Write a protein that binds this ligand. Structure first.
Ligand SMILES: Cc1[nH]c(-c2csc(N3CCNCC3)n2)c2c1C(=O)CCC2
Ligand SMILES: Cc1[nH]c(-c2csc(N3CCNCC3)n2)c2c1C(=O)CCC2
Length: 102
């Protein structure tokens, strides 16, 4: 049942206003320099697919994939960019609610 809270928090993240940059994997054909800079891309739908498949053995693995989405976001996007400003909203939301369970 370590993962039943992950379904809640991923469902809440999937439907958050500011989740639009992270619903689908970043298409590197459209973003100059992404493949070069971001070694391990991650997004909500890949997390949904791994969760759907049972690929998260512990609750901390799910959080590692989640923090990676935002570490990527800060690595590539300026803090005042549209994607950056949304990644900060999502990152505080995730951390604020991850602590509300743990
Ligand atoms: C994490 C991330 N999301 C986006 C982005 C821009 S537009 C858009 N969408 C989502 C897909 N269909 C509609 C509009 N998603 C970027 C990004 C980066 O890290 C680099 C800059 C571009
Ligand atoms: C998965 C994904 N879909 C799109 C997308 C569809 S339409 C459109 N534009 C951007 C330029 N002005 C016209 C409309 N962008 C992107 C994307 C990414 O991964 C990165 C950002 C771009």
């Amino acid at each position: 049942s370590d993962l039943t809270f992950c379904e809640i928090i991923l469902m809440e993240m999937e439907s958050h206003d500011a989740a639009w940059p992270f619903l689908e994997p970043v298409n590197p054909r459209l973003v100059s320099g992404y493949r070069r800079i971001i070694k391990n891309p991650m997004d909500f739908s890949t997390m949904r697919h791994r969760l759907s498949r049972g690929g998260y053995t512990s609750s901390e693995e799910f959080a590692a994939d989640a923090l990676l989405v935002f570490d990527n976001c800060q690595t590539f996007n300026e803090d005042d960019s549209e994607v950056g400003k949304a990644g900060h909203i999502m990152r505080r939301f995730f951390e604020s609610r991850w602590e509300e369970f743990y």
